[PDB]
Write an enzyme that holds these catalytic residues in place. Structure first.
Site, PDB file in Angstrom:
ATOM      1  N   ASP E  86      16.510  81.399  61.517  1.00  0.00           N
ATOM      2  CA  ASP E  86      16.988  81.774  60.190  1.00  0.00           C
ATOM      3  C   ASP E  86      18.151  80.927  59.681  1.00  0.00           C
ATOM      4  O   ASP E  86      18.249  80.692  58.480  1.00  0.00           O
ATOM      5  CB  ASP E  86      17.398  83.252  60.140  1.00  0.00           C
ATOM      6  CG  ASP E  86      16.210  84.194  60.057  1.00  0.00           C
ATOM      7  OD1 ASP E  86      15.157  83.805  59.515  1.00  0.00           O
ATOM      8  OD2 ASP E  86      16.338  85.342  60.524  1.00  0.00           O
ATOM      9  N   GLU E 150      12.398  71.507  84.393  1.00  0.00           N
ATOM     10  CA  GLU E 150      13.500  71.075  85.239  1.00  0.00           C
ATOM     11  C   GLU E 150      13.703  71.950  86.463  1.00  0.00           C
ATOM     12  O   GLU E 150      14.824  72.163  86.915  1.00  0.00           O
ATOM     13  CB  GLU E 150      14.786  70.996  84.411  1.00  0.00           C
ATOM     14  CG  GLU E 150      14.996  72.171  83.468  1.00  0.00           C
ATOM     15  CD  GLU E 150      16.241  72.008  82.629  1.00  0.00           C
ATOM     16  OE1 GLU E 150      16.914  70.966  82.785  1.00  0.00           O
ATOM     17  OE2 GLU E 150      16.544  72.910  81.823  1.00  0.00           O
TER      18      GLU E 150
HETATM   19 MG   LIG Z   1      18.974  71.336  81.893  1.00  0.00          MG
END
Ligand SMILES: [Mg+2]
Ligand SMILES: [Mg+2]
Ligand SMILES: [Mg+2]
Ligand SMILES: [Mg+2]
Ligand SMILES: [Mg+2]
Ligand SMILES: [Mg+2]
Lengths: 253, 253, 253, 253, 253, 253
Positions: E86, E150
């Protein structure tokens, strides 16, 4: 004093409470907004860029205003509710309340144990740093809980939710409800309208007052006649947007 | 440098650490607070209007202060702990630690894998943008974890929690504990007092130091004699409130 | 309501007004300060990091407080006074008022033409955006002007300054007067005390209440004994500083 | 400690001081800037959006840095200097010092009576709220005044300006001097270079170190070769701007 | 207008997008950063002190910049994503996406029902307060989702994740991935390198472009040759840190 | 691009420019304001709590808007104008321009030597940190100067003021002129109207467009009928105030 919560009482006596939404997220315009005379102003913490850092200045801006300050939490979770209760909010609007479970959590988050799960601090804006008489005892009875029914699930359980102890009002989020009913951006659809009145009907059914946001006057007037008591007739953002745009048009066409 | 964490070491050698709470949420008064000489100052992020935006200025205000900066997270969850570790907090106060599980999560949130689950950033206030020698290796050993026992469940498991690897200190939240024991606003109740000493007893039992917040001097002195080492004897808010009020009274009565 | 200015009235009636200085420059602590009960609080814009952006929040924080907000302008000049008037300050403290003309300038800076040179705006905090009745008319007769006699020349002209229409009270600046007399840091010096006494008599001589800042109690009582009516018995800064140092000491000494 | 002012000492000893300008106006980047190792950093309050509200955070961000903080006042006038002194600045850069009287005014603005006209406050960042020993006495002899010769009249009076008691260093403003000579944007012009050289000799002529701002390396080395001791070899703005443009280019070109 | 999302399209046509990380958390330096010419700038909300309050000013600072603004949420949860959508973010970087489940949640959080779970507001920065044509319909197709792989788990499921509808790009977080592979602070380890290329390989396998952060030019150039399209070649913080430090060194050694 | 200044051009061509005042002092609402479509918006730094820290965010909020940003300086003096020029303002409104010399001073304050006395900086928002082509050269011929005739002396010298090289438009300050004529609050007074008419003729007399602030429509049309070209038909404050009062009334009355 801070107690008793007069707003919470007006809702109980099902009096008509005319409110306005606030999203401008600042003390300057919000102080002006408090002069308007609305019965309640919703400082939106979900769809407006508001946070603890902006809430406090605005709450100070509203001091001495008839308008009852209501915070619309970003979501229904205990931590933020806790933090918002200590900075000085006594009325809450809980987005997306879909179950009786959630409805209870919300109520429990605004109440000190054993009645609830609220965390205890000894000096803050809520008890005005220890100057509020019989705070701990009073607090647990002077907090307004407004649950938003804006999902199909929330609708299906409207009855159980409205019957929940603590729930002071049933609020309808039109836009979200419409999107929830496959009519995004079209709340006027007879499908949405039927779901809206249903919620109202059930709210009244359990003695709890119903409410809604409707910037369009016709709708506002229709919902009031359908029985709704706490109705937001606009927002600072919206009236500011229309008023300014309109002003430019009456001179440039 | 930043390491080794001297505060974490004082706690280990169970030395008496005299602290003060901070809730005024601003760099100006907090810089003055750092001159007082307290061993540790808790920048309250749970019951005080503090956030990342106010934490950093205050941490800068405290640079060159003997006081060890401690942040009291708003709740025990990894994301906020992660963000707070990068902006420059090396000591943490974890509200509502009820289980050994939670105690581990908290510790894991302050440690880089595999030892923990901390997210890795290469330049920030924690490693002073890469100027801290052997940061990654050191960091995981120089973070203080202070868990708050302020619920019945937390009490029941005080032993397991205190035995947890990483937990550097057992802190008692009196007000919350009292509310938890059906005595909201009455921590002096013999019931609460017995629960408090129990926690202390068990803390000592597992070689971990115990701590508590007690703005009343008598209680503070009693807890110290009960063995507690890291004790907060007041808060900026409280002393400011009493001192100012008192000043007005000595001239107006 | 805004008008009449009760603080302005009390002074004229020479009734004792007990105040406190404010340098913390922030809404959070100043709200707590407003609870103390002082008859007036000085939001220092000369020796504290305060300005228009910090003033409004603090002014809002004081709404509801019995304390009369007083702003100490950084310097006696029309423009800043003009701006401070509109953000909501009805009481001013003017530093280094050395001549009758300067005193005149100050008063004029707070009044609309032809009484003074105050700039005109139709909507601001001062008239609460058009809600204060007969604002223009009433404003000119409801602004408290407190001039500071804190220099050699200011003393020489004390009588002329005190006889100026609009000067509601003669304030003594101990630290600066002392420096003006070659007694920096030693306001208690006989030469300084003599001047303070003199200013007080010349003030009373013109039926104008006298005032001064006395952080040390014994001095506050001495000056009140001499007849000073509006006396600042301390500052939030000095109190906070002193109280936090004391708390640390009683446990680390 | 605060006193003695080592930066003030180094200049007097005419030892090379390597600095950088600061216009980014924020604590985060300035803290990173403080790590670079410059002997002095100029928090520009004249051509950068800096002011008292941005200065304190940045001053706090520099605590611990070996860099000596220097503030460039927006203009040479008592009041702003008065306020900047109290928030923690011990080194000043005065723009457009055109006459001996103005140079005098600047020095006076930083010293307490009778040496100067500096206003007196008892608690502020400058004396670290009453903690700096013999503050009043020491402060008057520990304020570095750097005047900017950047106008025709300033050059004509360079000798008188440099011989003023209190002027710790003569600074050349390349962009403004150039404009003063009808060479806007062309400081490298022979007419401009000639004046810069002249100011340097007249500065050295009075045993006062010379300084200048040289973002281009070749110019920095040239001016240092000429004997300028305090030279600003760039700005955070220019460096950040140039370095980010370069990084983008090496991959998008 | 705001739509169509040109950045999202460049990624689809797998064009090379050169980006830079932003952690300085302020509008002043970020406006300068936008002049550099990068294809995308990641306003880091996870490892940089950024929040709603700093995001908006920076988004305004970036108006008129070619760089596509990308926000890196603090974590993968619907509430914050909602609030970030938003205020004006059209591209998202989702930290720690370990499963196809999570990947879907992330996508669903950026889409209005039934296609997703996004909350509906009628006036905000995203639809520029109602001036964006056919907003609701368009929005759901113009939001870029960049998931970060990751963790080991994220790797194991790289294929499923990359195949997910909505996932516009596969991003590799080197530092976290390295720590995840037992090589904290050593992403160059052949072990990490093999895991990195694997992710790239699979990204390409499912037609989705791959990306990575690599402040070291050699690595950046290597990853680009390995096929990666959206590559961040540095961060404001890093280039600022190196550039400033380097500048000091070329004059002080 | 930045140059040429289209607003400056339109005025010279005497084409009608429809503007609105801004006192809300915040980026959020001002961004919404920028959508209205006014040809110019006045960020009031004289009667609204605006300053450099609020100006930049608002200036950024207006990027992309067709509205020409105009700043109303707190007072006619070189320094503040110097600073406002660099943060990005190309159009100025000068209050209380009473003589030809003052008018001259204003113009000079916006031009680099030898045309004026504007200070020189090489990197700032004005030249967008070195990106605006031929900045120095072009800037001097692209700054709009709007002087306010709102005092007796200003009227007496209207012709001299209007004939000044650099004065791009004569603006009438209704509230202040009215007060100057002993008609505070009554600008509609025949004596006041007469002067407004006069200033307009003398303005047109010198081929300089005239302007005024008319929040009431009937007055706006009257002044436009008289030939005023740049007219402010209201303020965000007055519009917001009026529109929110109206909304409250239609439902609570
Ligand atoms: Mg990271
Ligand atoms: Mg909703
Ligand atoms: Mg607790
Ligand atoms: Mg004084
Ligand atoms: Mg210069
Ligand atoms: Mg005017």
């Amino acid at each position: 004093d801070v107690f008793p919560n007069k707003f919470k009482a007006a809702l109980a006596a099902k009096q008509v409470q005319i409110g306005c939404w606030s999203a401008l997220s600042n003390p300057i315009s919000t102080e002006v907004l408090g002069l308007a005379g609305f019965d309640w102003l919703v400082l939106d913490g979900e769809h407006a860029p508001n946070d603890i850092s902006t809430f406090i200045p605005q709450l100070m801006a509203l001091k001495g205003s008839a308008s009852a300050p209501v915070v619309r939490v970003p979501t229904n979770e205990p931590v933020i509710i806790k933090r918002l209760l200590d900075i000085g909010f006594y009325n809450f609007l809980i987005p997306f309340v879909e179950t009786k479970e959630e409805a209870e959590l919300a109520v429990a988050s605004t109440r000190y144990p054993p009645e609830g799960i609220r965390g205890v601090s000894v000096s803050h804006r809520a008890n005005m740093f220890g100057t509020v008489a019989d705070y701990f005892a009073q607090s647990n009875k002077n907090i307004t809980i407004l649950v938003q029914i804006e999902s199909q699930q929330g609708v299906d359980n409207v009855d159980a939710i409205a019957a929940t102890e603590g729930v002071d009002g049933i609020f309808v989020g039109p836009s979200d409800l419409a999107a929830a009913l496959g009519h995004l951006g079209n709340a006027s659809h007879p499908d949405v309208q039927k779901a809206i009145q249903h919620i109202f009907n059930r709210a009244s059914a359990h003695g709890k007052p119903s409410g809604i946001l409707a910037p369009v006057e016709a709708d506002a007037r229709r919902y009031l006649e359908w029985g709704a008591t706490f109705v937001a007739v606009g927002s600072d953002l919206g009236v500011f947007r229309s008023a300014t745009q309109k002003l430019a048009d009456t001179f440039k066409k």
